[PDB]
Design a protein around this ligand. Structure first.
Ligand SMILES: [Cl-]
Ligand SMILES: [Cl-]
Lengths: 120, 120
């Protein structure tokens, strides 16, 4: 179950869940990129993978988070794998801080994520 | 030399430097906390260590970055070691993204960092 489950637990447990899911993230990077529909980025700072396909995913799913120089390797891998990459700084930051990897997007980012998927 | 060296290199090299310095960060956590003067935090999201002592450090130095559930362990260690911990969300975020660990604070955060050190 990839449910974010927002109405459940303190900000403390949510941070433990984020860390725990990040700790099991991998992956490797190539596979993470390949399984994504789109990457949302803050260049040289943040890359977040998003998967959304009608019929498989009820909501957009966060597939990975990478930071700093890794973003440049994500960009290169995305180009080789044909995964579009978009600069969306506020969305990249919010997903960085709040989203759990391998879970559906938080409620607060539904509007912004929908915007990128219309583009895609 | 703990010089941030801001007028040098692209945002790309700065991200490689950040990652590289983060990769050699440790540390362990207890030692990182003990060597700090103060911790600046965004609760459940970010803890940044700052060291400043007249005569040793020309400028405040960033000693560590920790995120998510680690912040709770930082808080507990800081209490045991007598290191004050302050909630400063915009400063914590800016240092998270821009500062290099074991280097002097970026120029943009001089004003905000000075503010916390007057308090301390
Ligand atoms: Cl959900
Ligand atoms: Cl400097």
């Amino acid at each position: 179950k990839r449910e974010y489950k927002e109405m459940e637990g303190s900000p403390e447990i949510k941070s433990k869940r984020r860390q725990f899911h990040q700790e099991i993230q991998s992956g490797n990077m190539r596979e993470n990129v390949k399984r994504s529909s789109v990457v949302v980025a803050a260049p040289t700072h943040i890359a977040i993978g998003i998967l959304y396909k009608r019929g498989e995913t009820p909501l957009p799913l966060v597939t990975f988070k990478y930071t700093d120089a890794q973003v440049q390797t994500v960009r290169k891998i995305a180009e080789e794998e044909g995964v579009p990459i978009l600069q969306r700084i506020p969305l990249a930051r919010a997903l960085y801080w709040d989203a759990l990897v391998d879970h559906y997007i938080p409620a607060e980012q539904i509007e912004a994520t929908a915007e990128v998927l219309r583009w895609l």
